[PDB]
Point group: C7
Chain length 265, copies 7
């Protein structure tokens, strides 16, 4: 458990804490270039125009190529989705299989005092592998949650990895007010090369979590291999090895492992 929950707790809580660091350095959200002192107010109107006129205009105003890419408005918004999706395979196990393993935790904790009174009787335990001999496909339904997470992190690396090639010239563009021209056709200049503010801290934020999660993806692959190096294949590890390790989950007893020092001599 605790080899997994080091990842499963600290790493999703890393990214929202990283997401909170963006919120301190917001300041404003976008600026525009007014045409030389026509008001304080209509300049604010033109600035608020194009920031909402990003995605509805299906026409080509950015001349960038694949320019309706929605212009990364959602880096807190998408990271909010990816954080809570990683939170589920812990909580899915926690409310559907962690009580069933807590029964198994109780089931092994009466198995250990059975060895304890056997040593007191030394002054039936061999059946318990036959109690755990069957198929029990519900454990395989538990083990897929680690495989389920691996899909999420992989496309996350594709999602962040597309941004760096996207980060060449995706800040400066042309906007206009076409229907507001259509009401008068008189006074307002058409184009205003406005400029977004987000890429200066976001592009250098997308370096970190990608190269972190790249350096953490083989660890989950390693997590599905400790059952492989312990004498049974993954179709036959069904109950034995995921009970051998979770023997060391809550605690131990006074003669759980001090027997071996007695056994050494």
């Amino acid at each position: 458990d605790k080899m997994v929950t080091c990842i499963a707790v600290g790493l999703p809580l890393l990214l929202i804490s990283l997401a909170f660091a963006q919120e301190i350095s917001i300041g404003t959200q976008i600026s525009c270039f007014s045409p030389s002192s026509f008001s304080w107010r209509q300049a604010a109107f033109v600035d608020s125009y194009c920031w909402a006129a990003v995605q509805q205009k299906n026409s080509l105003q950015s001349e960038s190529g694949n320019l309706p890419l929605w212009l990364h408005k959602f880096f807190p918004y998408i990271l909010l989705l990816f954080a809570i999706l990683l939170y589920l395979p812990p909580l899915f196990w926690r409310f559907a299989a962690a009580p069933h393993i807590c029964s198994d935790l109780k089931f092994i904790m009466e198995e250990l005092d059975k060895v304890y009174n056997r040593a007191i009787k030394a002054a039936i335990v061999e059946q318990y592998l036959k109690t755990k001999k069957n198929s029990n496909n519900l454990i395989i339904k538990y083990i897929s949650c680690r495989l389920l997470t691996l899909i999420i992190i992989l496309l996350a690396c594709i999602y962040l990895g597309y941004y760096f090639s996207l980060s060449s010239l995706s800040d400066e563009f042309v906007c206009s007010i076409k229907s507001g021209i259509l009401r008068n056709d008189s006074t307002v200049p058409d184009q205003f090369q406005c400029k977004l503010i987000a890429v200066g801290i976001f592009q250098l934020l997308s370096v970190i979590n990608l190269v972190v999660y790249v350096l953490l993806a083989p660890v989950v692959v390693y997590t599905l291999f400790v059952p492989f190096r312990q004498k049974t294949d993954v179709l036959k590890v069904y109950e034995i090895l995921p009970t051998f390790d979770v023997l060391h989950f809550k605690s131990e007893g006074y003669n759980d492992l001090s027997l071996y020092n007695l056994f050494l001599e």
Copy 2:
């Protein structure tokens, strides 16, 4: 219980957390286009005019077709209604039937130790199906709350689903100050093509919860089918199967399910 409460808790708390994400990115609420520097103040007066002059003007100022559709002013407001309505069939069961099942939880917990002392006596339980033989229509009054929720999510999909076809050109419109013209008929220009700000993040917010709740609607249909695949029809499942599963609600005992491993050998 816990197969339902995974939906019943996390999914309504999803949408208010989604509703809180809107409140960070409010900024302003609407902008307008002043007629070229007449004041700082009267421009603010004209902007605050039309934002309240949306629904009272029964005349056709938007030339959009069915234009008094109230212009989606209420996406936090309607989602506040739908979140708390889903909260009720948990709380309706929790304050009217969860203590009655807690008595039944006590009633089955004395049934299980009766099997326990029977094994101690091995060193009357057969009557309990006849204790649960009657009609008990109050359980059917409990089971309709899942059916009650299904009505709410269905029209929610109609409510959000109408918005995407609504999202074609429902942002730009014409407004005026007619009675303020009627006081002088002298100076103020009539029409001002103002522009709302909400659709840029709301239309791309209404994608998510609809396609989530579409991918969750057959799960509640599946919830009313585990009584069907367990040897009695829905008119005859009255007490047996909703007590068989809630046997695994709070906890188990040391020989609740370890009997089967003893029974296997």
Copy 3:
């Protein structure tokens, strides 16, 4: 109890939560129309003038008919009164009759173990209806609190129901500064058709709680009818039926209702 407290707790806490939703969307409170750039400050003075000059001017400045109707300045203020008045008949019972029924809760809880040791003796309860034979008019003083609430909700429906007919043209009006003219009679124009901002969200807020409380008024009428369908009239229900149901208030015992399954066989 719990059939009533579902209404008595959630419904007054509904309306203050609805009242809190108004406070997020305040923004400003009123705007006015200045006469074309005379200052930033004197325009703010004229705007703050008429917002306080609403009710003191007993003259007819609105030409609306019954125009000193105080112009609904108090929708958070009146709802604050109606919320706390519904809070009293719970708390009036809670600090004056709930300990007396808690003594009766203790009085019936020693009556139930008297039946329990009678079953142990099977290996005087018939007197208790004669202990509850008298008039006990203090219970009728308890039961009027439900009738007391019904008066409050009825006139609340009249209060909110008057607003929709009031909502025709009760936003736009004429104001002036008459004594400020009287100091100089020189420069200031008289009338300024200012405009309030509140009706755009308040009129569509008064739809909800009215149609909710209309759909909840017969439930309290139903609450005074469960004593009617249980073999005694309301002058004779005095103690028996309001003790029969509150037997199921705190909890039950192991043979409170499992006797019936023993009695069935």
Copy 4:
């Protein structure tokens, strides 16, 4: 106790909650009328001048009659005094006489089990009225705190009641800057009919608590009459009746009042 503490707790906590409702609708505090765009700043200087020049100017600038009435600057400030003064006769009793009655609570709780073992002995209490036969003037020192509160609420009704006759024309007045004229005698106009903002919500706030406390003043008069209707006059009620009722303060016992149902038969 609990007949009094329903008033003694909820009613002072009512008025500070009413005082908190003022703080949300502050906005600004006073406005003034500048003489037509001389600065943004000196207009703010003249506005801040007269708001502090209210009470120091002993001359007649308001021409209202008794015009140094300090102009109700202190409605949160005075209500802060009246709220905490009502809080004292609870707390004065709570830290000086409530432990002494808690000893008496212990003293009567050993008197009740003395009746309990007497019924066990049925398978000396008559002395306790002679234990409570003396004068005990300290109880009369307790009972004056209710009389002490009645003085406070009475003059509070005079304080709020003077405001409605005061509310005729106590908002508009004349102010000037006399010494600032005395430095130059050149440029500044003298009088500026400024206008306060507070009376629009305060005068319609002073309706409520006055008519509430008028409808609560005879209740405290009724509180000093339950000792009168129970066979001894107020000079002779000294200990008996204020111990008869506080017998029902904390709790009761299993045969405190179930004796009467045994006594009925």
Copy 5:
């Protein structure tokens, strides 16, 4: 104890709560009179000039007489000192003599059960006055903390009492920028009759705590007199009377004072 701690707790916590009431009504801190629209900014510079140029200018700019009286900049600041200084003689006793009296509390609590088993033996206490016969000058070191507080409140009445005679014309004055003239000697006018804002609420705040603490000063004098009216002079009250009253500090026993009712008969 509790006759003192009613003063010692509530009265210092009164004044910081009074000090918090100032912080809500701050708004701004000082205003000045600009010379008729030279900038928004340099007017703010001149206003911030003189507010720091109050005390460093040892010259006579106020022409008031004793004009470097520092102009009461410190009414939250000085009240912060006087509040925490009153907090010390509680806390000085609490961390140096309250455990020693808690040992004495334990010492008298074994003296009371010695009387209790003596009544059980009725089915050596006379020595305890001789255990408390000595000088014990450490108790006189405790009793001076009440005398220590009396010095603080007395000069506090002098401190606040000097302010009312100070409050005649200590708000309006003359300021200038002399070295800023010395850089150019060209453009800036010299004098600007600025005006402070603090005296309008502070002078009418200094009425209250003075007349409160005047009406509380003889109570502490009364506190050093209950040892005088109980048969020993203040040089001889050393241990007996400050243990007689603190017998009633924590609690009593079942026969601590019910002995007297047994002794009455």
Copy 6:
């Protein structure tokens, strides 16, 4: 302990509470004098220029003598250092020697009940001075933390004490924009006698803590003298006297000090 922790807790928590009082009265941070209405913005640029151009300019712009004294920008910043440095010799003892004295607290608490059962046996303790006969230089490592604190407070008095002589004319100075002149050499005037705002409340803040800590420095000298007046020199006080006083640290027993009253007679 408690004679020290009265200083060690309340006095560092005094200064941060004093540091918090500065943060309420910040307002702005510095002002400057613009050259007569060139913009709102470039005036803000010149003001923000020199506030960062304080310490980097190694040239002589202040003509004050030792003018790169960094101009007391750090009075919250330095006081933050001095507060947390005083917090360490408590916490250094608390996590390295307070458990070792808690073992000694346990070690003396079994020594006291050994005297208690000796009195029960009256119906070996003399060895314990020989248990505490050795050198135990770790106690001298504890006692230097009081000496360690004394160094910090002494230079703190030098640090604050240098400020008053510094407070003569260290607010007004000359600044310029030299490289901004170097880009054009055309328009901008060179010098602007700006003015800081901090000394008006800081110089009269540095009076207090200095004269407080001067009046507390001999108390720590007195703290290292109670071992001197109790029959052994500071090289020989090693364990006896710092265990004699901490006998009275947690509590006492029923016959810890009541033996002396038995011993008196």
Copy 7:
């Protein structure tokens, strides 16, 4: 443990508290020099331009040498990384080896009462060094976390140490709007010597933590030397010495170390 956790807790919590001190003195973030009153708004546009145009412009606009050094935008951002990286080797041990040493804490706590009943038997312990005779390479996996931290602090000293040589002239630079010139080539001047604000408090902040962590780096070197001065080399200290010291971790017993005083005599 506690010799390490004095560093491991207080020193990372030092730097975030130091990081919080920056956030109070933010104010603004950057200023620029407008070209002499062209608007309020376009000046704000040019200022927001270059603050985002820092790192994307790969051209040489600063003429400083290695000028794309990203200009220390990340001093809260980088310190956030270094603080949480130091937090891991505590938490890595805490969730993977602290329960295993808590089992060893239980394992030694039954070893100590074995000595206790041996003294009771005086009215097998010698085997326990042979229970701790093996290799146990997992302890060496624990001890590398101190070595892991030392790498982080070393390059932190390189990171902060590069800043002081960087702090010569890394604040003033040249910026322009090249594509905004490219749209018109008409009106806007090219270069504007803007100026950052951060180095005035940051360069004098980077003094402290570097010279602190330099004065703490040999302490961790000393931490890996207490196993060296206790009779076994670091390849042979495997279990004995890291159990000898953590014997004094939680507590001791009444005869854990009082045996030595018995052993002295």
